[PDB]
Design a protein around this ligand. Sequence first.
Ligand SMILES: Nc1ncnc2c1ncn2[C@@H]1O[C@H](COP(=O)(O)OP(=O)(O)OC[C@H]2O[C@@H]([n+]3cccc(C(=O)O)c3)[C@H](O)[C@@H]2O)[C@@H](O)[C@H]1O
Ligand SMILES: Nc1ncnc2c1ncn2[C@@H]1O[C@H](COP(=O)(O)OP(=O)(O)OC[C@H]2O[C@@H]([n+]3cccc(C(=O)O)c3)[C@H](O)[C@@H]2O)[C@@H](O)[C@H]1O
Ligand SMILES: Nc1ncnc2c1ncn2[C@@H]1O[C@H](COP(=O)(O)OP(=O)(O)OP(=O)(O)O)[C@@H](O)[C@H]1O
Ligand SMILES: [Mg+2]
Lengths: 271, 246
Amino acid sequence: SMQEKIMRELHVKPSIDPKQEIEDRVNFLKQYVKKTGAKGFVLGISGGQDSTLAGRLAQLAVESIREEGGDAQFIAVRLPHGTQQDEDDAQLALKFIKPDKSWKFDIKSTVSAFSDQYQQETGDQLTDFNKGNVKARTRMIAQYAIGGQEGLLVLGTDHAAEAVTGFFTKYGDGGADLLPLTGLTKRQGRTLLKELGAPERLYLKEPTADLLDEKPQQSDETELGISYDEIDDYLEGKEVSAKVSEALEKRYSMTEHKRQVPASMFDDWWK
Amino acid sequence: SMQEKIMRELHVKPSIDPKQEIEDRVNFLKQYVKKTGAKGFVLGISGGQDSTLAGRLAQLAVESIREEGGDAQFIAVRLPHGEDDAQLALKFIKPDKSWKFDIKSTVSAFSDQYQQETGDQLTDFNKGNVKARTRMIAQYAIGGQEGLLVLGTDHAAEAVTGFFTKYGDGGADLLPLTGLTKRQGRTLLKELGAPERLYLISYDEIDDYLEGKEVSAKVSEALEKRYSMTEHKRQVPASMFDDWWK
Ligand SMILES: Nc1ncnc2c1ncn2[C@@H]1O[C@H](COP(=O)(O)OP(=O)(O)OC[C@H]2O[C@@H]([n+]3cccc(C(=O)O)c3)[C@H](O)[C@@H]2O)[C@@H](O)[C@H]1O
Ligand SMILES: Nc1ncnc2c1ncn2[C@@H]1O[C@H](COP(=O)(O)OP(=O)(O)OC[C@H]2O[C@@H]([n+]3cccc(C(=O)O)c3)[C@H](O)[C@@H]2O)[C@@H](O)[C@H]1O
Ligand SMILES: Nc1ncnc2c1ncn2[C@@H]1O[C@H](COP(=O)(O)OP(=O)(O)OP(=O)(O)O)[C@@H](O)[C@H]1O
Ligand SMILES: [Mg+2]
């Protein structure tokens, strides 16, 4: 069964124990830190559900490590491109996460320098969509710069509901060192945030990439054409309409390249 | 045996037929592009051995596809930070298109912004990684604008040591040089008829290790340690369901 295969590959559990999931994921963060001797984590905080959840998990892991006598820190970073329309949500997220450190890095001048150079070098102007991907990749650079400067690992917010659609920028937000949210569907992530006591605003808002200058705050569902609820039912193994299966299985096959290391002639997944 | 395990995982062959290797690798590029419907490839050309080799294979692949009546193009891009060898490489590769994207203004802006926001200046090392990642962005910007796949120049000798920037020069779509040792790549370049100026622990020691030849315990222990330490660069981001990191 395709549904069954996609579920196993994305590590989705049809039924979770919220409390245990948090314990498991915080323990994963701690184990990884100890194994690598890293000093902690850095994660861009957007004000959206995913980074809010990953952020809180990283803070809990770091506090748990210190409590045991270890040394670890967590730097949450605001990465606006100029003014962020929902900056207030990002600030709310920070108030909830309570990170050790809250930094900010405005990516606008870097993206502008890039775009200008692009037009200068090719005579062409970057399309809104392509510039959006430059923004996502510039955020990865900003996080790795901070991680490299301070000796921290970069957390990624990828989870099953976005992995299934390849709904992330290759080497942009998809570029991270570890993924604490792997296998969680969108509603399961929301369940974890409720368990953690997060303000409802953070999980009630519409998921957005917010990468376009022409259409800022464009909802994921708008670009995708499927709702997160249909995506989650599928991932959780619920019998869904053939229209959902067909759309998702098609999207999954086309984005396999985003879930694998660069392709070589010795790889079969692409044939 | 660690040497044997590594050799198997990196797909290195003890000996190669240079003519056949070129054919197989050109075929891989043609096959991948055809499977995907992409319009061609983009590759940053530095004047170095690896990109010169990857570039020539890409140009041959694109010419092969057009020969079969298809549509494919190769854009070689110079990515200076603000050139003689790169020019020699271009003369040898003869790409359909030869572009340039100076990354200095982007890196400077990032660098100034980092100092403003943090109060810290980016150290040389970290600034080097920013340059590698900016090159990745430029290649993908071009690829995204033109509908091309980004080629990576990673090979076995570079993969064992993790000597590349994660999401920088390591960020690519396909890897035509996978499994090749440094010396084997030199052999392919010679076979292709590249000028010597382009293809000319000990890097030759790394090659011996990868090809399954006997090396000192010092070489082995060194490489095997560096290999396990860089596993994270050869895998997708780690999750609790992954085992390789434990
Ligand atoms: N089959 C293939 N094999 C190997 N590589 C392949 C490939 N097909 C394309 N490629 C490459 O992949 C590239 C396309 O992938 P990518 O560059 O990711 O670009 P793309 O998928 O076209 O854009 C990223 C998308 O994910 C989204 N996203 C991004 C960032 C954040 C969020 C969020 O909600 O915050 C959502 C977004 O809104 C957009 O819909 C191509 O230019 C190409 O170089
Ligand atoms: N075990 C772990 N699990 C998950 N992630 C881990 C990790 N340990 C560190 N990390 C991370 O990855 C990082 C370090 O890797 P990375 O950022 O690649 O940085 P790094 O390994 O420091 O890359 C720079 C270097 O690679 C070489 N290089 C660089 C650029 C180009 C080329 C060329 O020849 O063209 C060669 C070179 O010999 C050199 O000094 C961290 O800052 C951290 O985020
Ligand atoms: N404006 C920004 N400020 C800080 N970090 C950012 C910014 N925009 C995106 N990111 C980051 O890159 C990511 C990918 O963004 P994405 O929109 O998929 O996630 P999210 O916003 O946390 O939640 P949702 O997916 O529900 O919108 C993050 O989750 C976050 O770490
Ligand atoms: Mg968002």
